[PDB]
Amino acid sequence: LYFQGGSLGTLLDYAAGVIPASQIRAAGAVGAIRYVSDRRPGGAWMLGKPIQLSEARDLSGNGLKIVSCYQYGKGSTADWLGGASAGVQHARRGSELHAAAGGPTSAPIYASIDDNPSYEQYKNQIVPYLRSWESVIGHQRTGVYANSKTIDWAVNDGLGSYFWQHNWGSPKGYTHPAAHLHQVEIDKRKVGGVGVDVNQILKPQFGQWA
Incomplete structure (x- = not known):
């Protein structure tokens, strides 16, 4: 990675x-980015979806940070394919699961673009999808998980207030x-018998609940 802090x-x-908070802490992590989403068909094994209130209390009590993210579908069922209508459906559900997990209204939800879209897909489908997320929870609460190209387009269009970069389609090391x-x-290690992805905090205010 090019040095950038x-x-x-x-x-x-x-x-x-x-994952119990004690195992997150023992793995040298300061918190977790947790799903405020349901288990899609073929995802009945996803016992990490959604975060429930008892887990949020365990993490918070242990001094760990919590961040909410949302991903329901993938690939041919990616959430953003349905544009504006899909954005209202997924944002409403994510906001309900965030509240039921004990998430505060001051905290954002990172909507997922788990893809490497073309600019045409971004304009036709991702822009109305993210506009609908902003219509439901507000611009100040809308986070975007996407590659660096998609983050740049979203920044230029003023969509989203928080950005979480993935590397699918991002220029190498950028x-x-x-x-x-x-x-x-991604998918290279386990913590407490659960496969985990590793993320780095780049800015001190990154959407943590507290």
């Missing part, structure tokens, strides 16, 4: 299960300077 701490993200968070490792 350094990590301010590691956050883990995971869908397969719930970190977008607007990114709050950066996913740096």
Whole structure:
């Protein structure tokens, strides 16, 4: 990675299960980015979706940071394919699951673009999708998980207030300077028997609940 500052701490993200706060801390992570989403068809193994209130209390009590993210579908069922209508459906559900997990209204939700879209896909589908997220929870609460190209387009269009960079389609070694968070490792390690992805905190205010 080109140097562009350094990590301010590691956050883990995971869908397969719930990890006790003691095991997150023992893995050298300062918190987790957790799903405020349901399990899609073929995802009944995703016991990490959604975060429930008892887990949020365990993490918060242990002094760990919590960040909310949303991803329901993937690939041919990616959430953003449905544009404006899909954005209202997914944002409403994410906001309900965030509140039921104990998430505060002051905290954002990172909507996921788990893809490497063309600019035409971005204009036709991702722009109305993110506009609908902003219509439901507000611009100040809308986070975007996407590659660096998509973050740049969203920044230029004024969509989203928080950005979490993934590397699918991002130029090698590049970190977008607007990114709050950066996913740096995927499906290469487990914590408490649960497969995790590793993220670095880049900005001190990155959408943590507290």
